[PDB]
Design a binder for this molecule. Structure first.
Ligand SMILES: *[C@@H]1O[C@H](CO)[C@@H](O[C@@H]2O[C@H](CO)[C@@H](O[C@@H]3O[C@H](CO[C@H]4O[C@H](CO)[C@@H](O)[C@H](O[C@H]5O[C@H](CO)[C@@H](O)[C@H](O)[C@@H]5O)[C@@H]4O)[C@@H](O)[C@H](O[C@H]4O[C@H](CO)[C@@H](O)[C@H](O)[C@@H]4O)[C@@H]3O)[C@H](O)[C@H]2NC(C)=O)[C@H](O)[C@H]1NC(C)=O
Ligand code: NAG
Ligand code: NAG
Ligand code: NAG
Ligand code: NAG
Ligand code: NAG
Ligand code: NAG
Lengths: 122, 112, 128, 122, 122
């Protein structure tokens, strides 16, 4: 495609395709500095994997969930988002409610394996 | 000779055509409870494994050679007769922990 | 994918015993069985028996059980997948009925149902 | 709910709900000491994820398996466990057989993807 | 079974069974050297998990995919591979095309969740 971050100024619909390109390259004064950045790299990465895990998205690149889109977050249509705004434009507009939706995905996953546990009781 | 596994005696063919060789015996050596291996064997020289486990070919064996095993006999077909096929072919019945119970032999002539 | 050279053409007389060699190369000698086959003037081909260079285990047809002396050495490793070994063949009560060409044959696979199938043949040795 | 470890003295049935709270907060003399604890934190965490992976539970918070409950581990009923004992009481009673059940979960997962591999051969 | 790497000289069909044995044991001058090897151990491990993730194999030990076996990689039958060659023999023969198949697995996973995303639109 375009490379690493190649579709940063592209529409959210075009950048959403081939997301495995920004998924690969995500993971003594010189020595201590270099080892300092090596440990931090694994920490920031595992935090994202920790989040994807407690959402049911562990292993997913595109992951649909149960939480409905509250129009208080953004009253924009799908067409005026994915075919117009860029991924950097979008999450500045959602920046406030981003911490609210992280909590919603976690309860929708703990109230999904708990309903799944009763399902396999029969 | 005392081979309990009889073949097709002899058979002939022509260039571009296809032949078939039989290989059957009593229920003591054939067939639904035994694998069938097919050997190309020039007279008293270096043999060659053509087909093993009924229909499976050895490494590098030409796709012309085919195999088939019914509940009482196994067949070796030589599709598209090329001139270098004049030899004698033997079959053998075997399992995983046994030996090759060879066949009587079948000379194939390609004269054309 | 290797050679299995044998001995020469030694011709003795009935009652005696003959030793036949089978030197391997180009393949892991311990990974494959060594079969012994012959084609005599009076019958056709006849399977005698195979021996395991690894398990040291022998299985031979009842028609040759009380006549055949069958042994192997131990491979001399050349690389990680290459070695050099030798299998030996002897017979007890010898006659002119056993006159024929003899070869050794390395097994086909290492697992499954056609493990010992004589695939890679030697060169042939003419008996009495 | 109650917070981090909030239901440590609660029944196993109450503490088993909302387990994403103890799942989030699981991941020079001052500098070396601090980096020493940072590397150890990722090691202890990945060991648990390594275990959940070779059990088929990679991504699960509640994970049912095939290994039947051997009464030699505990001859107690489900009601006198989940509605009475606490999670710290329980695993002291199972402490011995804990290493035995880790081996059982691993063979039930290698004998599940191996039966799954033959399933997709058709 | 045989232990760690116990079936290294065995057939690929025998070694492919019980792969959870080489999956467990995969994860100041003395102090800096020891911490240097500890960080590298987690990096090499997470690279393999990163690869298994962007292939849909996150959590799998045996993982079937959609990429057909191109005979340009190896024109050998299944029987003359799994019942003859060892795992160390095989990947020396595939060594060249190994980087080509890593790219094929990644596009077959991004073109699987993208077809899955349209599936759940109805
Ligand atoms: C190291 O590498 C060597 C060489 O590659 C491996 O040895 C080979 O292993 C394979 C599979 O493990 C063997 O193939 C099997 O052969 C048996 C035949 O054994 C039967 O007959 C023997 C002679 O008649 C007899 O000795 C056996 O009896 C027991 O006693 C001996 C004592 O000597 C003991 O050593 C044996 O192990 C036996 O327990 C036995 O009666 C055959 O039966 C097998 O077929 C069955 O299994 C396959 C699946 O494996 C299945 O598909 C079949 O349908 C059938 O159910 C199988 O063909 C081979 O013979 C070995 N030797 C060689 C190739 O020379 C060794 O395993 C490797 N070890 C390691 C640790 O990697
Ligand atoms: C939307 O979010 C607000 C809080 O931000 C909440 O009060 C409201 O109930 C939500 N509505 C829907 C439909 O989700
Ligand atoms: C987020 O909150 C700040 C509060 O200072 C507000 O100014 C901003 O408009 C909010 N973001 C959005 C997208 O409304
Ligand atoms: C229970 O475990 C013992 C060993 O602790 C074992 O011998 C026994 O077979 C097991 N029984 C069941 C039913 O799992
Ligand atoms: C575990 O083993 C010890 C051995 O000293 C024993 O005393 C203890 O009772 C065992 N645990 C249980 C729960 O039985
Ligand atoms: C096999 O790979 C080659 C390149 O190595 C490619 O050109 C060819 O199209 C591929 N064929 C199949 C059937 O995958
Ligand atoms: C890989 O490429 C090298 C190029 O030097 C070649 O020699 C080698 O044969 C190739 N590998 C295979 C398995 O063909």
């Amino acid at each position: 495609i375009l490379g690493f971050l190649g579709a940063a100024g592209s529409t959210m619909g075009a950048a959403s395709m081939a997301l495995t390109v920004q998924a690969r390259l995500l993971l003594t004064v010189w020595g201590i500095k270099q080892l300092q950045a090596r440990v931090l790299a694994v920490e920031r990465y595992l935090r994202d994997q920790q989040l994807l895990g407690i959402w049911g998205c562990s292993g997913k690149i595109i992951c649909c969930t149960n939480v409905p889109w509250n129009d208080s977050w953004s009253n924009k249509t799908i067409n005026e988002i994915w075919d117009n705004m860029t991924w950097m434009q979008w999450e500045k507009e959602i920046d406030n409610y981003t911490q609210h939706i992280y909590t919603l995905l976690e309860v929708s996953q703990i109230q999904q394996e708990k309903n799944e546990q009763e399902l396999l009781e029969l | 000779s005392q081979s309990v596994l009889t073949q097709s005696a002899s058979v002939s063919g022509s260039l571009g055509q296809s032949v078939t060789i039989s290989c059957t015996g009593p229920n003591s050596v054939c067939c639904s409870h035994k694998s069938i291996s097919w050997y190309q064997w020039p007279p008293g020289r270096a043999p060659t494994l053509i087909i093993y486990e009924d229909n499976e070919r050895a490494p590098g064996i030409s796709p012309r050679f085919s195999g088939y095993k019914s509940y009482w006999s196994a067949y070796l077909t030589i599709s598209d007769l090329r001139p270098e096929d004049e030899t004698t072919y033997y079959c053998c019945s075997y399992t995983h922990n046994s030996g090759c119970v060879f066949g009587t032999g079948t000379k194939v002539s390609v004269l054309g | 994918q290797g050679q299995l050279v044998q001995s020469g053409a030694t011709t003795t007389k009935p009652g005696s015993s003959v030793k036949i060699s089978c030197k391997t190369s180009g393949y892991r000698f311990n990974f494959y069985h060594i079969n012994w086959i012959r084609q005599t003037a009076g019958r056709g081909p006849e399977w005698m028996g195979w021996i395991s260079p690894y398990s040291g285990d022998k299985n031979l047809a009842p028609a040759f059980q009380d006549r055949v002396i069958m042994t192997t050495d131990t491979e001399v490793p050349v690389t990680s997948f290459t070695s050099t070994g030798a299998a030996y063949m002897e017979i007890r009560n010898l006659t002119s009925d056993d006159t024929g060409t003899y070869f050794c044959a390395k097994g086909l696979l290492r697992d499954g149902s056609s493990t010992w199938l004589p695939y890679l043949w030697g060169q042939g040795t003419l008996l009495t």
